Design a protein around this nucleic acid. Structure first.
Ligand code: NA
Length: 92
DNA sequence: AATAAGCGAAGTGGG
DNA sequence: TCCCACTTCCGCTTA
């Protein structure tokens, strides 16, 4: 099964949900979710995973928090809904 | 208050 | 056995 960071990177590369997520500085790997349209993207994540319950942005962000300990994805301080892929994730 | 967002122990998958 | 990679639940804090 695809991992959450790869799901998000693939969305950013494809442009398929441009109203829900976008690059802020692609060279740095920084991206941001839409306040108003993030739930649609969270829903897609849960459907792609085949999870039992409906996925919410809150649950998806709880998973993202675990990446922050390992550095896979860092949450940008002093910003909302903004994150940054590690250099390793971006190299493929 | 209402709403949004940040923060951070037990249950489920698939090894 | 016991870790992976989240998922779900619960609830407090900050804006
Ligand atoms: Na526990």
């Amino acid at each position: 099964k695809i991992r959450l960071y790869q799901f998000l990177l693939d969305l950013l590369r494809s442009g398929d949900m441009k109203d829900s997520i976008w690059w802020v500085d692609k060279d740095k790997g920084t991206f941001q979710f839409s306040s108003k349209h993030k739930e649609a993207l969270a829903h897609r994540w849960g459907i792609q995973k085949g999870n039992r319950k409906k996925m919410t942005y809150q649950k998806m962000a709880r998973a993202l928090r675990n990446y922050g300990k390992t550095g896979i994805i860092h949450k940008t301080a002093k910003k909302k809904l903004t994150y940054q892929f590690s250099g390793e994730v971006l190299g493929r």
